[PDB]
Amino acid sequence: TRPAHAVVLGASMAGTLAAHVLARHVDAVTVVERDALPEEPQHRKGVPQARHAHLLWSNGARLIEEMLPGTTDRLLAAGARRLGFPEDLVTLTGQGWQHRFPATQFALVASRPLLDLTVRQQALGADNITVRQRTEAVELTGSGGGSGGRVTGVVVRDLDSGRQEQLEADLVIDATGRGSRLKQWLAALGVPALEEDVVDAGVAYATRLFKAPPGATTHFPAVNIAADDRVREPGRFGVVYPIEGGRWLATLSCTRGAQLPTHEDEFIPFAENLNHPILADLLRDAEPLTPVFGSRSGANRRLYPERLEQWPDGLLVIGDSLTAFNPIYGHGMSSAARCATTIDREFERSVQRAGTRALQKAIGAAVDDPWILAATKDIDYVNCRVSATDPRLIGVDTEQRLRFAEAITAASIRSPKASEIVTDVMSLNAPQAELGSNRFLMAMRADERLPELTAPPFLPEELAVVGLDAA
Amino acid sequence: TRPAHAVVLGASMAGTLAAHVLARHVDAVTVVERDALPEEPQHRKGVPQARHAHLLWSNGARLIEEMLPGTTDRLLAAGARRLGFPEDLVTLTGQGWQHRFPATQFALVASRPLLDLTVRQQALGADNITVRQRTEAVELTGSGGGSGGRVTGVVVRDLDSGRQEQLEADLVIDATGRGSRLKQWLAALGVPALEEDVVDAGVAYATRLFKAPPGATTHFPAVNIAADDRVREPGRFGVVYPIEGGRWLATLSCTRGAQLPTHEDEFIPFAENLNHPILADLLRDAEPLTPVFGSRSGANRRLYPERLEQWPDGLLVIGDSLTAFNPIYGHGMSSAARCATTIDREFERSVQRAGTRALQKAIGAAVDDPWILAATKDIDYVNCRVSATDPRLIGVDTEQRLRFAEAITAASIRSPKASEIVTDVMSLNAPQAELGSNRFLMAMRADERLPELTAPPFLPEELAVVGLDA
Numbered sequence A: 001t002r003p004a005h006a007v008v009l010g011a012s013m014a015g016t017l018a019a020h021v022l023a024r025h026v027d028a029v030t031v032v033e034r035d036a037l038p039e040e041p042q043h044r045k046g047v048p049q050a051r052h053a054h055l056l057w058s059n060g061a062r063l064i065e066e067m068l069p070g071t072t073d074r075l076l077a078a079g080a081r082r083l084g085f086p087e088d089l090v091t092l093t094g095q096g097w098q099h100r101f102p103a104t105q106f107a108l109v110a111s112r113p114l115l116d117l118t119v120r121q122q123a124l125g126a127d128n129i130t131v132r133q134r135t136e137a138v139e140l141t142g143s144g145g146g147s148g149g150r151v152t153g154v155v156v157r158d159l160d161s162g163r164q165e166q167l168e169a170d171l172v173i174d175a176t177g178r179g180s181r182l183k184q185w186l187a188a189l190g191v192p193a194l195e196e197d198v199v200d201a202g203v204a205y206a207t208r209l210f211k212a213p214p215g216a217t218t219h220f221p222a223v224n225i226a227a228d229d230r231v232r233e234p235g236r237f238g239v240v241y242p243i244e245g246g247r248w249l250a251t252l253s254c255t256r257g258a259q260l261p262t263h264e265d266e267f268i269p270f271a272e273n274l275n276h277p278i279l280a281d282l283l284r285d286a287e288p289l290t291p292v293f294g295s296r297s298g299a300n301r302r303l304y305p306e307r308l309e310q311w312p313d314g315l316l317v318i319g320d321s322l323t324a325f326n327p328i329y330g331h332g333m334s335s336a337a338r339c340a341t342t343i344d345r346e347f348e349r350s351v352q353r354a355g356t357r358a359l360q361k362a363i364g365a366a367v368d369d370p371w372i373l374a375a376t377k378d379i380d381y382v383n384c385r386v387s388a389t390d391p392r393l394i395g396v397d398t399e400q401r402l403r404f405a406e407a408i409t410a411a412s413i414r415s416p417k418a419s420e421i422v423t424d425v426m427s428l429n430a431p432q433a434e435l436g437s438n439r440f441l442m443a444m445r446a447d448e449r450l451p452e453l454t455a456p457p458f459l460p461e462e463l464a465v466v467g468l469d470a471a
Numbered sequence B: 001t002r003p004a005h006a007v008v009l010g011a012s013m014a015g016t017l018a019a020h021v022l023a024r025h026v027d028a029v030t031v032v033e034r035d036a037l038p039e040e041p042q043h044r045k046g047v048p049q050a051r052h053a054h055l056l057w058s059n060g061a062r063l064i065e066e067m068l069p070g071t072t073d074r075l076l077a078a079g080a081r082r083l084g085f086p087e088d089l090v091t092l093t094g095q096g097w098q099h100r101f102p103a104t105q106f107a108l109v110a111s112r113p114l115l116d117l118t119v120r121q122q123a124l125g126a127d128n129i130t131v132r133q134r135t136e137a138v139e140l141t142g143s144g145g146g147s148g149g150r151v152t153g154v155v156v157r158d159l160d161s162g163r164q165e166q167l168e169a170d171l172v173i174d175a176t177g178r179g180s181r182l183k184q185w186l187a188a189l190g191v192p193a194l195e196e197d198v199v200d201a202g203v204a205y206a207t208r209l210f211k212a213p214p215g216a217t218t219h220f221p222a223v224n225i226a227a228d229d230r231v232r233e234p235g236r237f238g239v240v241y242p243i244e245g246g247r248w249l250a251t252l253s254c255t256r257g258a259q260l261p262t263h264e265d266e267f268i269p270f271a272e273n274l275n276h277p278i279l280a281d282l283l284r285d286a287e288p289l290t291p292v293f294g295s296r297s298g299a300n301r302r303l304y305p306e307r308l309e310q311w312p313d314g315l316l317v318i319g320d321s322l323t324a325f326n327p328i329y330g331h332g333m334s335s336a337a338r339c340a341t342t343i344d345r346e347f348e349r350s351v352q353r354a355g356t357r358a359l360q361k362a363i364g365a366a367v368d369d370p371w372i373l374a375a376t377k378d379i380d381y382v383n384c385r386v387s388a389t390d391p392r393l394i395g396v397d398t399e400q401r402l403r404f405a406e407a408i409t410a411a412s413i414r415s416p417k418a419s420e421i422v423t424d425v426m427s428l429n430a431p432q433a434e435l436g437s438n439r440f441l442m443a444m445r446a447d448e449r450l451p452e453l454t455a456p457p458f459l460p461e462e463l464a465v466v467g468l469d470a
């Protein structure tokens, strides 16, 4: 018999997309969210990462567009911007400035609260979706361990009354994010511990919101400075992204060993000590609208429920709860869209439980691309904490992995054919392994390499919008 | 290490597509084929089924088009026809005539030798593909048994010289077809026996090519008769497809228990004893160009190498050899395209040996749709021989499967919304399980049902091109 009631824990991007998908296949869906969901673009404590710069890469943007047609146009009408890569960005890599080749990929950029609200407005309006705001999931009900175990429902607590209730379900979806209590819920059902890979470069983030020079959010590119050209030293990075309302979102980041700004008067000096001070020059006369927001959620971690024999029937885990990545590569929301898309494409085949386990295996395969990309890039940072069994990571020459990464970067910034393939991998539209293919290696040697840029490739009319001259 | 030499055993559609794919990722590929590959459309002993009706459904057509751009345009320029479903077909089901709704899917139809050569011409021209024509693979080399072995190469015979030769390889692809010798090659390295699911309704086929009335191949629909409305006696079917050169391809079919025309003067009598005699009335004044070609390759069979722990490294199996289906549903070439597309999509991720089995598991998952579709439809035929472990087949009440198949068919022929989803499953673009989805059940209840057609839905101008009335 088919499932008739599904419960989705968490109403952020992973839970909202899964709720919309499951409503097409299940008679009734209940969404359990700890926060009150605002009706206007507004931050909330359940998604504290929304304070920092967010790119929706073309992989997630297309997956969301095919699930919810019109979403992209609604975002743009609300002030979001479609950044073309590498065309609409002034980017400094460890190998030099990126030539602004005609765009081969894109990313939608906006405030994360606007993007969350726009998606919620297009997904949660179905008649068979019930949203229980200000309701907290406390534990799962059912049985675990041995064989034959299965999750029957979830205990929820109403936060305005304090009363608890048993919410029975044929299917429970954990989408509660990086701070998820899944390991406690599992152990309370007698389920053994899950396998977990971790690659933790100790990345932290400091963000301020600025009023951009008038017109810059439309006629000035995004700027990204990534300083990693030495490997015995921690990485230090910085981005300035345009968002709706004529505002600049500036996010500074560093790996373990470096020092982030903890006060407002340390923000611009950090940008002045990157490999090029262009982010400081842009933000020197810009009006700050916020204090400095911080984040320490920069580890790469992946659970493998698809490997656990004692995985209970009727339970799935998606989003940051299943796996989370270093935000610098900006794949979290695309991974959430992949989880919902995989449920949509595999649900009917997986029912008629071999279905719950088949869905979880399909979900695990869909999140491999953002995992192996972020972990490959972070594993070689100095003082990185590594605890993973992935043979693509652990059994690899460390000199050769670094040298090859440098060669990939050197080709992408100055070779059109190499840049196109790299943006495919960067946009999560091609696996990381494609950079080791015969196709990429032949493109890397055969393609032309343009001369090295000795200054940031701003067009003069872009410098005129922000009131600068000669880089 | 990244494979530097791959060998594909067998040409035809599975081998040709896989060879084109592997050439993108491996330095050199060898294609070893028993027959001489002709440079113009001609049948051959290695693919004797090419004499029978062949539809390239949109699933395989799109996968081939994305692999080999321009192939669809060359086929149409060479005389192939893009039949829209259900618009361009007059089809009689066990529930009645199919309303010719605007096309929601399509299939390319032409002679199989023409389609084969067109794909060969656009796939095997790469500089790093070497074709060993008139060369036969006899056995595999390597190790097997115990811990799980590994494949080193293949022994080949040159047929114009008579010489044997050892061809080592980092990766061997079996694309030999339904009569493939893989299970003996396995035992020859001591690899345990593979799991196999079989649903064999004993389907046989008789085909005669006719010269169609001038213009019929372009302005007249294909006709498909499925005489299937009783479950206690064998099914008998018949189709007439247009192909290039102004010719009609007529393929007659039956399941175990019935008798096909095995003599030429019984061919049209078989067509007049279908549930409607329209295919006989079409073929009585038609000029016969061939004798009747026969085939008894109508069983559904699936190997499960993805389940065998001791599967040797460096070996993959694709096409009809891995799994074959009842031709009546026409998914074999689309399944061959799926295996090649899956190899292309997963190859780089699978290397960087865990790769060969990762590729084989991905290939096995891609061939599930045509297997469960053909097996679900064939399992309940009278005197059908079943040897399978698939719980989607074994643990099903047969009344519930029979009743639902009738409701799916009755909805598809007279409800537009239901027809759209059914053609998606029929064209192999949606899994069979979609017909049990809440989405499909809601479409069946909510959508209108048009009145029953009491006559074949020919337009008056279509009857006039073939010279009939009513």
Ligand SMILES: Cc1cc2nc3c(=O)[nH]c(=O)nc-3n(C[C@H](O)[C@H](O)[C@H](O)COP(=O)(O)OP(=O)(O)OC[C@H]3O[C@@H](n4cnc5c(N)ncnc54)[C@H](O)[C@@H]3O)c2cc1C
Binding pocket: A009, A010, A011, A012, A013, A014, A015, A032, A033, A034, A035, A045, A046, A047, A049, A050, A052, A053, A054, A055, A056, A057, A135, A136, A137, A138, A175, A176, A177, A178, A179, A180, A205, A295, A297, A318, A319, A320, A321, A327, A328, A329, A330, A331, A332, A333, A334, A335, A336
């Ligand atoms: C600094 C930073 C920058 C990032 N930048 C990007 C970027 O540029 N691009 C990108 O794609 N991704 C980015 N990410 C990742 C992205 O924010 C997440 O991947 C995305 O939010 C998906 O997470 P999720 O929906 O699974 O969980 P979350 O977004 O964390 O949401 C979890 C939800 O569950 C709720 N919840 C928690 N516990 C309970 C409970 N017990 N009961 C009920 N509800 C509960 C919470 O209130 C919340 O609504 C970034 C992350 C960080 C930290």
Ligand SMILES: Cc1cc2nc3c(=O)[nH]c(=O)nc-3n(C[C@H](O)[C@H](O)[C@H](O)COP(=O)(O)OP(=O)(O)OC[C@H]3O[C@@H](n4cnc5c(N)ncnc54)[C@H](O)[C@@H]3O)c2cc1C
Binding pocket: B009, B010, B011, B012, B013, B014, B015, B032, B033, B034, B035, B045, B046, B047, B049, B052, B053, B054, B055, B056, B057, B135, B136, B137, B138, B175, B176, B177, B178, B180, B205, B295, B297, B298, B318, B319, B320, B321, B327, B329, B330, B331, B332, B333, B334, B336
């Ligand atoms: C009557 C009938 C009708 C069909 N109709 C359709 C249809 O409408 N649509 C559709 O999509 N499919 C149809 N099929 C299925 C389709 O023919 C096959 O699925 C398709 O050809 C894929 O098979 P293959 O390439 O894997 O193997 P095959 O096409 O059988 O090719 C195997 C090749 O390997 C070669 N070979 C074999 N052994 C050796 C050896 N030892 N050494 C060297 N070379 C060797 C052979 O010479 C041959 O060239 C039909 C099949 C039949 C029987």
Ligand SMILES: CC(=O)OC/C=C(\C)CC/C=C(\C)CCC=C(C)C
Binding pocket: A052, A053, A054, A055, A093, A094, A205, A224, A226, A227, A228, A237, A238, A239, A251, A253, A327, A328, A329, A330, A377
């Ligand atoms: C040197 C290196 O890291 O190579 C990869 C660099 C990339 C992929 C560009 C850097 C991207 C960012 C800093 C994103 C902005 C920050 C957040 C979304 C939190």
Ligand SMILES: [Cl-]
Binding pocket: A048, A049, A050, A294, A295, A296, A297
């Ligand atoms: Cl955060």
